[PDB]
Design a protein around this ligand. Sequence first.
Ligand SMILES: C[S@@+](CC[C@H](N)C(=O)[O-])C[C@H]1O[C@@H](n2cnc3c(N)ncnc32)[C@H](O)[C@@H]1O
Ligand SMILES: [Zn+2]
Ligand SMILES: [Zn+2]
Lengths: 120, 283
Amino acid sequence: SSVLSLVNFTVDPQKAYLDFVNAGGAPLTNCVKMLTPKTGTGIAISVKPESTADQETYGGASVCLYCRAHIEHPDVSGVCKYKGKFVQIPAQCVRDPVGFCLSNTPCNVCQYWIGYGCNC
Amino acid sequence: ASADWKPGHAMPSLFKVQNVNLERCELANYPMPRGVHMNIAKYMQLCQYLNTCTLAVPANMRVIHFGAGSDKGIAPGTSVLRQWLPTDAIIIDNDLNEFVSDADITLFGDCVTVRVGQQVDLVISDMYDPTSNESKALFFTYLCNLINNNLALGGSVAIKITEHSWSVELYELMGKFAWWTVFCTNANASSSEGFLLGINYLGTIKENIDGGAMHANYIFWRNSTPMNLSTYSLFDLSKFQLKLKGTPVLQLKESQINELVISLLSQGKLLIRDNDTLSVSTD
Ligand SMILES: C[S@@+](CC[C@H](N)C(=O)[O-])C[C@H]1O[C@@H](n2cnc3c(N)ncnc32)[C@H](O)[C@@H]1O
Ligand SMILES: [Zn+2]
Ligand SMILES: [Zn+2]
């Protein structure tokens, strides 16, 4: 509830979260990690869990900074890209799923995380 | 033990037919982690049990989830419902307190402020107010009225109760379903919690139930029944998702509901309700 206060006192919540955890701040906790058959396609964001053996799956709203801090979404459409969906995170990055999601982007034609599955 | 591999225990007719006084609930084990929130395992086990029930599963399935929030401000049960239900199911969730969820619609405030315009297909309640063991009112008055007015014929409910959080009238309403039980997850087997399940609503009394006596039977069952904490049932999730049944939705006058229709409703093969666009809003 410290980092959730912090991203409210700023114009650039993404940068503030990332700078906070990059300087030793505690990641946002209570991301909703699901139990899945680790047999999915491994795409970044999906209707249903799609985690591979190398990944974990989270409920989308719980790993979205803008949802968790109850602040305006930056998407031009106003519509969240995670909420109501599932988000696959690399299993090496489970310590800070919110940070991973702010730090990365899915490929626009293959839908896998760039640097974490996109073979384009 | 076999039962450790099941998602939990369902109250048997052996205890449903007893006739005993209400006694204190004394459980021997009153603790397994799984990395995830405990409610992840609890909801998935409730879903696994419902997978064995004759649930109606239509297109655009209408699901309301009450008590979906937590003191963490997140909704693990709603995310399990999202993982379990068909992609085109509509999920509406509600809690007294603010939270964020993967529901399609999220309503804050007392459930009595939730105005259901059209009948729904599935009601999940995890409502519980932490604050002699008499029948309780609270949100149970709202749920009872919902079953009588805003639930499709063929629809089902799963309503959290405990030793002290229960309702005479809600047990009696279980007699208006084709089948009912109380289901206790293995993940939370050391709590007096159970989910009162009504499967396939018929709108008419099929079983005459004395709700006070039946809660006494529920406690007698819990007091009589070793249950081990467990999550073994979540090891193979290959069949976890709710089967895509394409259950038909029909509009019928009560005059036309005959023996064939009742039989289809009772088998999980039909819903009767409006096929409108679902409007569910805060009053
Ligand atoms: C054990 S918690 C639910 C945990 C949640 N289901 C999950 O997925 O973690 C019980 C919830 O019931 C809610 N509640 C109690 N009475 C209510 C009411 N009258 N109307 C709406 N919600 C109510 C409380 O606010 C509390 O969040
Ligand atoms: Zn969001
Ligand atoms: Zn790509």
